[PDB]
Amino acid sequence: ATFEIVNRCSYTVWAAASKGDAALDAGGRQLNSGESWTINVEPGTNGGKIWARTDCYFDDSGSGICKTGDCGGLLRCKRFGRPPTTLAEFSLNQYGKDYIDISNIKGFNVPMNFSPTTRGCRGVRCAADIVGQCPAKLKAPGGGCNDACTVFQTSEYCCTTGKCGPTEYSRFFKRLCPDAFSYVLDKPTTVTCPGSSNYRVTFCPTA
């Protein structure tokens, strides 16, 4: 499948693409404002994620740091990024269907559109100003809005027992982004696409 990753942000982001134990394609890249990065994702990719990273420094070997979504200091991600990270999440060719979603379960750093570029289902969007509205106790100093599980490390926020409810913090992300996951047992906002759909992830789809 092709993912076009477009930075519509006025600031540089470092796109990341990972299934948690491996890079997707090159796994990461600098996107200046307006730049597009086309990646190929293997059919059958299960638990694929795309995210933006903000305020990166990389040396000549692609080693360094980001204030948001840093994945063990690499330009080319093999691992998931450090929260806060708005997540484009995908499982491709699962019994003839694609599953896409946006998640705020690892917090929010960069507004995001995740849309098919092929026909047969709808995109999802989390483009509200979650960083600007972020509750004082979830504010990441580096930039972005932590989820309550990253900050407080409780069974309730992490949903560690497989049982828990919405929270004051999960409802803040849900109120600003109804179409994103807000907590682990949130009513699914997963969209079903045709198997082998293609996608665009847009950072700052409106701003």
PDB file of C-alpha atoms in Angstrom:
ATOM      1  CA  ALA A   1       0.000   0.000   0.000  1.00  0.00           C
ATOM      2  CA  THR A   2       1.145   3.614  -0.573  1.00  0.00           C
ATOM      3  CA  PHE A   3       0.986   6.195   2.264  1.00  0.00           C
ATOM      4  CA  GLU A   4       1.514   9.816   1.125  1.00  0.00           C
ATOM      5  CA  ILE A   5       2.675  11.663   4.321  1.00  0.00           C
ATOM      6  CA  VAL A   6       2.147  15.459   3.763  1.00  0.00           C
ATOM      7  CA  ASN A   7       3.396  18.122   6.269  1.00  0.00           C
ATOM      8  CA  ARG A   8       0.825  20.999   5.925  1.00  0.00           C
ATOM      9  CA  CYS A   9       2.299  22.432   9.236  1.00  0.00           C
ATOM     10  CA  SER A  10       4.032  25.867   9.044  1.00  0.00           C
ATOM     11  CA  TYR A  11       6.864  24.072  11.063  1.00  0.00           C
ATOM     12  CA  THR A  12       9.221  21.133  10.115  1.00  0.00           C
ATOM     13  CA  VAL A  13       8.049  17.676  11.388  1.00  0.00           C
ATOM     14  CA  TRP A  14      10.041  14.408  11.285  1.00  0.00           C
ATOM     15  CA  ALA A  15       7.524  11.788   9.972  1.00  0.00           C
ATOM     16  CA  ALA A  16       7.886   8.300  11.527  1.00  0.00           C
ATOM     17  CA  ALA A  17       6.473   4.967  10.265  1.00  0.00           C
ATOM     18  CA  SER A  18       6.825   1.794  12.398  1.00  0.00           C
ATOM     19  CA  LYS A  19       4.974  -1.474  13.293  1.00  0.00           C
ATOM     20  CA  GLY A  20       6.714  -1.443  16.741  1.00  0.00           C
ATOM     21  CA  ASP A  21       9.505  -4.074  16.069  1.00  0.00           C
ATOM     22  CA  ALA A  22      10.477  -2.677  12.548  1.00  0.00           C
ATOM     23  CA  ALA A  23      10.636   0.480  10.389  1.00  0.00           C
ATOM     24  CA  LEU A  24       7.881   0.895   7.758  1.00  0.00           C
ATOM     25  CA  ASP A  25       9.799   1.794   4.517  1.00  0.00           C
ATOM     26  CA  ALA A  26      12.730   4.111   5.563  1.00  0.00           C
ATOM     27  CA  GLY A  27      10.892   4.484   8.976  1.00  0.00           C
ATOM     28  CA  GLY A  28      11.416   8.272   9.245  1.00  0.00           C
ATOM     29  CA  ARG A  29      12.203  11.505   7.382  1.00  0.00           C
ATOM     30  CA  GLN A  30      12.418  15.306   7.744  1.00  0.00           C
ATOM     31  CA  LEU A  31       9.302  16.980   6.244  1.00  0.00           C
ATOM     32  CA  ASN A  32       9.670  20.784   5.788  1.00  0.00           C
ATOM     33  CA  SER A  33       6.370  22.790   5.585  1.00  0.00           C
ATOM     34  CA  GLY A  34       4.513  21.590   2.442  1.00  0.00           C
ATOM     35  CA  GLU A  35       6.763  18.526   1.760  1.00  0.00           C
ATOM     36  CA  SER A  36       5.248  15.090   0.777  1.00  0.00           C
ATOM     37  CA  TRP A  37       6.919  11.714   1.567  1.00  0.00           C
ATOM     38  CA  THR A  38       5.501   8.637  -0.262  1.00  0.00           C
ATOM     39  CA  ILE A  39       6.169   5.338   1.658  1.00  0.00           C
ATOM     40  CA  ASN A  40       5.371   1.723   0.574  1.00  0.00           C
ATOM     41  CA  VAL A  41       3.836  -0.382   3.475  1.00  0.00           C
ATOM     42  CA  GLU A  42       3.884  -4.230   2.944  1.00  0.00           C
ATOM     43  CA  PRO A  43       0.373  -5.777   2.440  1.00  0.00           C
ATOM     44  CA  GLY A  44      -0.696  -7.638   5.632  1.00  0.00           C
ATOM     45  CA  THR A  45       1.133  -5.016   7.875  1.00  0.00           C
ATOM     46  CA  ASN A  46      -0.555  -5.481  11.339  1.00  0.00           C
ATOM     47  CA  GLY A  47      -0.247  -2.666  13.973  1.00  0.00           C
ATOM     48  CA  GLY A  48       1.377  -0.098  11.597  1.00  0.00           C
ATOM     49  CA  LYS A  49       1.645   3.463  13.048  1.00  0.00           C
ATOM     50  CA  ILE A  50       2.508   6.870  11.487  1.00  0.00           C
ATOM     51  CA  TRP A  51       3.284   9.955  13.655  1.00  0.00           C
ATOM     52  CA  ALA A  52       4.953  13.375  13.514  1.00  0.00           C
ATOM     53  CA  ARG A  53       7.998  14.235  15.676  1.00  0.00           C
ATOM     54  CA  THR A  54       8.665  17.933  16.567  1.00  0.00           C
ATOM     55  CA  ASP A  55      11.970  19.855  17.375  1.00  0.00           C
ATOM     56  CA  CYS A  56      14.430  17.159  16.201  1.00  0.00           C
ATOM     57  CA  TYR A  57      18.228  17.397  16.112  1.00  0.00           C
ATOM     58  CA  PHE A  58      19.884  14.612  14.001  1.00  0.00           C
ATOM     59  CA  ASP A  59      23.700  14.389  13.381  1.00  0.00           C
ATOM     60  CA  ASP A  60      25.059  12.976  10.022  1.00  0.00           C
ATOM     61  CA  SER A  61      24.423   9.260  11.035  1.00  0.00           C
ATOM     62  CA  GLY A  62      20.638   9.885  11.790  1.00  0.00           C
ATOM     63  CA  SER A  63      21.130   9.870  15.651  1.00  0.00           C
ATOM     64  CA  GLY A  64      19.747  12.627  17.898  1.00  0.00           C
ATOM     65  CA  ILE A  65      16.605  13.660  19.788  1.00  0.00           C
ATOM     66  CA  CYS A  66      12.994  14.913  19.422  1.00  0.00           C
ATOM     67  CA  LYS A  67      10.834  16.819  21.943  1.00  0.00           C
ATOM     68  CA  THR A  68       7.794  14.630  20.811  1.00  0.00           C
ATOM     69  CA  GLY A  69       7.529  11.063  19.343  1.00  0.00           C
ATOM     70  CA  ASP A  70      11.318  10.327  19.728  1.00  0.00           C
ATOM     71  CA  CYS A  71      11.955   6.594  18.948  1.00  0.00           C
ATOM     72  CA  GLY A  72      15.266   5.770  20.776  1.00  0.00           C
ATOM     73  CA  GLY A  73      17.033   8.834  19.240  1.00  0.00           C
ATOM     74  CA  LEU A  74      16.805   7.574  15.564  1.00  0.00           C
ATOM     75  CA  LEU A  75      15.812   9.567  12.398  1.00  0.00           C
ATOM     76  CA  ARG A  76      14.672   6.152  10.899  1.00  0.00           C
ATOM     77  CA  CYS A  77      12.164   4.713  13.493  1.00  0.00           C
ATOM     78  CA  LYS A  78      12.266   0.896  14.205  1.00  0.00           C
ATOM     79  CA  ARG A  79      10.218   1.415  17.453  1.00  0.00           C
ATOM     80  CA  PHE A  80       7.109   3.423  18.478  1.00  0.00           C
ATOM     81  CA  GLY A  81       7.750   7.059  19.478  1.00  0.00           C
ATOM     82  CA  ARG A  82       7.748   8.547  23.025  1.00  0.00           C
ATOM     83  CA  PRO A  83       4.326  10.198  23.930  1.00  0.00           C
ATOM     84  CA  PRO A  84       2.859  12.677  23.332  1.00  0.00           C
ATOM     85  CA  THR A  85       2.092  11.440  19.727  1.00  0.00           C
ATOM     86  CA  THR A  86      -1.142  11.783  17.668  1.00  0.00           C
ATOM     87  CA  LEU A  87      -1.183   8.244  16.029  1.00  0.00           C
ATOM     88  CA  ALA A  88      -2.304   7.270  12.491  1.00  0.00           C
ATOM     89  CA  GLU A  89      -2.956   3.500  13.168  1.00  0.00           C
ATOM     90  CA  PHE A  90      -3.491   0.785  10.518  1.00  0.00           C
ATOM     91  CA  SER A  91      -3.877  -2.978  10.042  1.00  0.00           C
ATOM     92  CA  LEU A  92      -3.851  -3.863   6.267  1.00  0.00           C
ATOM     93  CA  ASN A  93      -5.364  -6.949   4.468  1.00  0.00           C
ATOM     94  CA  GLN A  94      -6.959  -8.341   7.711  1.00  0.00           C
ATOM     95  CA  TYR A  95      -9.437 -10.942   6.238  1.00  0.00           C
ATOM     96  CA  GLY A  96      -9.812  -8.750   3.056  1.00  0.00           C
ATOM     97  CA  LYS A  97     -10.227  -5.400   4.989  1.00  0.00           C
ATOM     98  CA  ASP A  98      -8.013  -2.442   6.012  1.00  0.00           C
ATOM     99  CA  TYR A  99      -8.589  -0.967   9.545  1.00  0.00           C
ATOM    100  CA  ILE A 100      -7.497   2.713  10.032  1.00  0.00           C
ATOM    101  CA  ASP A 101      -7.949   5.028  13.045  1.00  0.00           C
ATOM    102  CA  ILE A 102      -6.533   8.109  14.745  1.00  0.00           C
ATOM    103  CA  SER A 103      -5.619   7.568  18.445  1.00  0.00           C
ATOM    104  CA  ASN A 104      -5.034  10.049  21.338  1.00  0.00           C
ATOM    105  CA  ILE A 105      -4.306   7.040  23.668  1.00  0.00           C
ATOM    106  CA  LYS A 106      -0.577   8.087  23.542  1.00  0.00           C
ATOM    107  CA  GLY A 107      -1.564  11.791  23.790  1.00  0.00           C
ATOM    108  CA  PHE A 108      -1.437  14.490  21.054  1.00  0.00           C
ATOM    109  CA  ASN A 109       1.499  16.572  19.573  1.00  0.00           C
ATOM    110  CA  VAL A 110       0.425  17.432  15.937  1.00  0.00           C
ATOM    111  CA  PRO A 111      -3.110  17.684  14.389  1.00  0.00           C
ATOM    112  CA  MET A 112      -3.666  14.952  11.747  1.00  0.00           C
ATOM    113  CA  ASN A 113      -5.904  13.820   8.871  1.00  0.00           C
ATOM    114  CA  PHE A 114      -5.743  10.045   8.022  1.00  0.00           C
ATOM    115  CA  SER A 115      -7.729   9.509   4.705  1.00  0.00           C
ATOM    116  CA  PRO A 116      -7.847   6.820   1.959  1.00  0.00           C
ATOM    117  CA  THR A 117      -6.733   8.149  -1.496  1.00  0.00           C
ATOM    118  CA  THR A 118      -8.687   5.155  -3.048  1.00  0.00           C
ATOM    119  CA  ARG A 119     -12.527   4.730  -2.866  1.00  0.00           C
ATOM    120  CA  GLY A 120     -14.813   2.844  -0.445  1.00  0.00           C
ATOM    121  CA  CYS A 121     -14.553   4.522   2.997  1.00  0.00           C
ATOM    122  CA  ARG A 122     -14.039   7.847   4.857  1.00  0.00           C
ATOM    123  CA  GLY A 123     -10.969   9.475   6.473  1.00  0.00           C
ATOM    124  CA  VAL A 124     -10.706  10.328  10.189  1.00  0.00           C
ATOM    125  CA  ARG A 125      -9.388  13.642  11.586  1.00  0.00           C
ATOM    126  CA  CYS A 126      -8.052  14.955  14.906  1.00  0.00           C
ATOM    127  CA  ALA A 127      -7.366  18.667  14.055  1.00  0.00           C
ATOM    128  CA  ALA A 128      -8.654  20.505  17.196  1.00  0.00           C
ATOM    129  CA  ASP A 129      -6.119  22.659  19.194  1.00  0.00           C
ATOM    130  CA  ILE A 130      -5.574  19.880  21.882  1.00  0.00           C
ATOM    131  CA  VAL A 131      -2.086  21.365  22.820  1.00  0.00           C
ATOM    132  CA  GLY A 132      -3.529  24.904  23.363  1.00  0.00           C
ATOM    133  CA  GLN A 133      -6.602  23.614  25.341  1.00  0.00           C
ATOM    134  CA  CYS A 134      -4.533  20.869  27.150  1.00  0.00           C
ATOM    135  CA  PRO A 135      -5.309  20.421  30.901  1.00  0.00           C
ATOM    136  CA  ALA A 136      -2.406  21.810  33.031  1.00  0.00           C
ATOM    137  CA  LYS A 137      -1.431  18.293  34.425  1.00  0.00           C
ATOM    138  CA  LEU A 138      -1.200  16.674  30.888  1.00  0.00           C
ATOM    139  CA  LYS A 139       0.972  19.510  29.333  1.00  0.00           C
ATOM    140  CA  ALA A 140       4.296  18.025  28.087  1.00  0.00           C
ATOM    141  CA  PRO A 141       7.098  20.662  28.675  1.00  0.00           C
ATOM    142  CA  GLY A 142       8.661  19.589  25.295  1.00  0.00           C
ATOM    143  CA  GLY A 143       5.362  20.509  23.524  1.00  0.00           C
ATOM    144  CA  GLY A 144       2.115  18.518  23.168  1.00  0.00           C
ATOM    145  CA  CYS A 145      -0.608  16.995  25.412  1.00  0.00           C
ATOM    146  CA  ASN A 146       0.151  13.740  27.316  1.00  0.00           C
ATOM    147  CA  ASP A 147      -2.589  11.110  27.808  1.00  0.00           C
ATOM    148  CA  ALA A 148      -3.365  10.459  31.567  1.00  0.00           C
ATOM    149  CA  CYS A 149      -1.790   6.900  31.342  1.00  0.00           C
ATOM    150  CA  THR A 150       1.724   8.305  30.403  1.00  0.00           C
ATOM    151  CA  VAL A 151       1.476  10.987  33.203  1.00  0.00           C
ATOM    152  CA  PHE A 152      -0.115   9.039  36.175  1.00  0.00           C
ATOM    153  CA  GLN A 153       0.680   5.326  35.405  1.00  0.00           C
ATOM    154  CA  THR A 154      -2.587   4.046  37.077  1.00  0.00           C
ATOM    155  CA  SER A 155      -4.601   0.837  36.277  1.00  0.00           C
ATOM    156  CA  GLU A 156      -7.627   3.156  35.489  1.00  0.00           C
ATOM    157  CA  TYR A 157      -5.815   5.426  32.881  1.00  0.00           C
ATOM    158  CA  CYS A 158      -3.645   2.565  31.355  1.00  0.00           C
ATOM    159  CA  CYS A 159      -6.652   0.125  31.444  1.00  0.00           C
ATOM    160  CA  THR A 160      -4.158  -2.487  32.835  1.00  0.00           C
ATOM    161  CA  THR A 161      -6.850  -5.019  34.092  1.00  0.00           C
ATOM    162  CA  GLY A 162      -8.774  -4.776  30.748  1.00  0.00           C
ATOM    163  CA  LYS A 163     -11.531  -3.043  32.845  1.00  0.00           C
ATOM    164  CA  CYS A 164     -11.845   0.769  33.121  1.00  0.00           C
ATOM    165  CA  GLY A 165     -14.027   3.710  32.123  1.00  0.00           C
ATOM    166  CA  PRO A 166     -13.704   7.100  30.473  1.00  0.00           C
ATOM    167  CA  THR A 167     -12.007   9.684  32.757  1.00  0.00           C
ATOM    168  CA  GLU A 168     -11.919  13.505  33.091  1.00  0.00           C
ATOM    169  CA  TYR A 169      -8.663  13.332  30.964  1.00  0.00           C
ATOM    170  CA  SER A 170      -9.955  10.849  28.272  1.00  0.00           C
ATOM    171  CA  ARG A 171     -13.168  13.035  27.940  1.00  0.00           C
ATOM    172  CA  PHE A 172     -10.986  16.147  27.269  1.00  0.00           C
ATOM    173  CA  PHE A 173      -9.357  14.343  24.214  1.00  0.00           C
ATOM    174  CA  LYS A 174     -12.812  12.851  23.163  1.00  0.00           C
ATOM    175  CA  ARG A 175     -14.665  16.273  23.402  1.00  0.00           C
ATOM    176  CA  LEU A 176     -11.993  17.948  21.146  1.00  0.00           C
ATOM    177  CA  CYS A 177     -11.634  14.794  18.863  1.00  0.00           C
ATOM    178  CA  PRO A 178     -14.726  12.507  18.842  1.00  0.00           C
ATOM    179  CA  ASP A 179     -13.296  10.596  15.824  1.00  0.00           C
ATOM    180  CA  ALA A 180     -10.044   9.549  17.686  1.00  0.00           C
ATOM    181  CA  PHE A 181      -9.519   6.873  20.472  1.00  0.00           C
ATOM    182  CA  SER A 182      -9.397   8.816  23.835  1.00  0.00           C
ATOM    183  CA  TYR A 183      -8.719   5.678  26.073  1.00  0.00           C
ATOM    184  CA  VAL A 184      -8.006   1.881  25.583  1.00  0.00           C
ATOM    185  CA  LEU A 185     -11.725   0.783  25.877  1.00  0.00           C
ATOM    186  CA  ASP A 186     -13.138   3.866  23.997  1.00  0.00           C
ATOM    187  CA  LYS A 187     -16.077   2.883  21.695  1.00  0.00           C
ATOM    188  CA  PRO A 188     -14.006   2.075  18.507  1.00  0.00           C
ATOM    189  CA  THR A 189     -13.673   4.924  15.907  1.00  0.00           C
ATOM    190  CA  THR A 190     -11.927   2.362  13.604  1.00  0.00           C
ATOM    191  CA  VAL A 191     -12.871   2.893   9.912  1.00  0.00           C
ATOM    192  CA  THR A 192     -13.181  -0.268   7.702  1.00  0.00           C
ATOM    193  CA  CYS A 193     -11.534   0.222   4.222  1.00  0.00           C
ATOM    194  CA  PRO A 194     -11.262  -2.248   1.285  1.00  0.00           C
ATOM    195  CA  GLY A 195      -8.155  -4.500   1.450  1.00  0.00           C
ATOM    196  CA  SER A 196      -5.133  -2.761  -0.299  1.00  0.00           C
ATOM    197  CA  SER A 197      -6.551   0.814  -0.017  1.00  0.00           C
ATOM    198  CA  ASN A 198      -3.957   3.648  -0.334  1.00  0.00           C
ATOM    199  CA  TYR A 199      -3.742   6.524   2.217  1.00  0.00           C
ATOM    200  CA  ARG A 200      -2.674  10.107   2.884  1.00  0.00           C
ATOM    201  CA  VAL A 201      -1.622  11.198   6.395  1.00  0.00           C
ATOM    202  CA  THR A 202      -1.712  15.054   6.501  1.00  0.00           C
ATOM    203  CA  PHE A 203      -0.043  16.884   9.482  1.00  0.00           C
ATOM    204  CA  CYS A 204      -1.940  20.174  10.152  1.00  0.00           C
ATOM    205  CA  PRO A 205      -4.811  19.374   7.700  1.00  0.00           C
ATOM    206  CA  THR A 206      -6.520  22.816   8.364  1.00  0.00           C
ATOM    207  CA  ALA A 207      -3.770  25.076   9.961  1.00  0.00           C
TER     208      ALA A 207
END
